[PDB]
Amino acid sequence: FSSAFSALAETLDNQEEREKLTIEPSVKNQQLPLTVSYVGQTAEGAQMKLAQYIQQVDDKVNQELEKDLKDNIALGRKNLQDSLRTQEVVAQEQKDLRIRQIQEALQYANQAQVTKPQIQQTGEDITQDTLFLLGSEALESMIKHEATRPLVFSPNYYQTRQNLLDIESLKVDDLDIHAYRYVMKPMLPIRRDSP
Amino acid sequence: RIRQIQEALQYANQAQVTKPQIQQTGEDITQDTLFLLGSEALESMIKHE
Amino acid sequence: ATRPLVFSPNYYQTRQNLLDIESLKVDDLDIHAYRYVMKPMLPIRRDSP
């Protein structure tokens, strides 16, 4: 705001008749509160003109941010719909290895003659070596029904899937941006400055 | 999880596991060892979906 | 010789980091090194003489 209000201050000196309009910090040490001003020709006509020029810069900043957020959200859900496609092909390179681990464990369970499952339980996922204890019959169905076996997804996938539904749900039209706050409404003066 | 159960009914239909063979599980049951719950107990996890 | 290798979860991180570096496109990527807060004016009062 303070750089777009001082950029309105320099396009009002390019009028045929100049209109002075300034902006400055209030006390000479800290940055804000800022102190805008304007000189006119009447008491009423220099307060109406200042409250118009505050709303003119405010409607330029507020439209340069709803336009900026729409180019950030519609591009932010493109780097997430891509990051769910490259994270799914990794999740099928793990599935194509799990079918290959099962396809080797059918050869171990065909020589050791394990047909019915000998596993009573497993407290974790079954590794490569102890995979043949599921049986010769139950491992022949994990290869026959291979293309319909569902993928498994890491908990980082469901984090960036929930991060895409959060970026698709927020709305910028009803979102209100305000770049400034009145601590003093624009006054109308009693004593003129000249003559 | 319904799709993991729906595939594990096909494994437990060929291996002929009807009654549950699991005595316990110290964690959640994964995709591979899900067919040990049985053919009968996995037909009710799909009917009551 | 047909027994499959097992890969650490740092391998599948840097495998997913290669598919992310092969998928991004620089032709449709727009870079802007500046932003107008004031369009270039045309002056009314000259400077000299």
Author numbering:
A (entry chain A): 99 to 293
B (entry chain B): 196 to 244
C (entry chain H): 245 to 293
Reproduce, without paraphrasing, sentences from the article in which this PDB structure was first reported.
Polysaccharide co-polymerases are a large family of membrane proteins that play an essential role in regulating the length distribution of the synthesized polysaccharide chain by interacting with the membrane-bound polymerase Wzy as it assembles the growing Oag or ECA polysaccharide of the LPS. Key to the Wzy-dependent pathway is the polysaccharide co-polymerase Wzz that is known to homo-oligomerize into a unique bell-shaped structure. As well as being assembled into bell-shaped structures common features include a membrane topology consisting of an N (TM1) and C (TM2) terminal transmembrane helix, an elongated periplasmic α-helical domain containing a predicted coiled-coil region and conserved sequence motifs such as a Proline-rich segment proximal to TM2 and a glycine-rich segment within TM2. With that in mind, we determined and herby report the structure of a fully intact example polysaccharide co-polymerase, WzzB, from E. coli by cryo-electron microscopy to an overall resolution of 3.0 Å.
Since an octameric complex is clearly visible in the unsymmetrized map, 8-fold (C8) symmetry was applied which led to a marked improvement in overall resolution to 3.0 Å. The high quality of the map allowed ~95% of the amino acid sequence to be unambiguously built, revealing structural details of the transmembrane and cytoplasmic domains as well as a highly conserved proline-rich segment proximal to the C-terminal transmembrane helix. Herein, the loop is positioned on the inside of the cavity and extends to the center of the periplasmic domain in a similar conformation as seen in the structure of a Salmonella typhimurium/Shigella flexneri WzzB chimera. While the first two prolines of this motif are seen in the trans conformation, P293 is best modeled in the cis-conformation in the density of our structure. The cis-conformation of the ω torsion angle of proline 293 creates a unique kink in this linker region thus helping to direct the C-terminal transmembrane helix into position. In the octameric assembly, the 2-helix bundles are ~32 Å apart (when measured from center to center) and do not interact with one another. Within each bundle their closest interactions are at their cross-point, which perhaps not surprisingly, coincides with the conserved GXXXG motif that has been found in ~50% of all α-helical membrane proteins and is suggested to be involved in helix-helix packing. Each of the pillars is tilted slightly inward toward the center of the chamber, reducing the inner diameter from ~75 Å on the periplasmic side to ~64 Å on the cytoplasmic side and the outer diameter from ~100 Å on the periplasmic side to ~83 Å on the cytoplasmic side. However, at the N-terminal end of the protein, a short amphipathic helix (α0) runs parallel to the membrane and interacts with TM2 of its helix bundle as well as with TM2 of the neighboring protomer, which curves slightly toward α0.
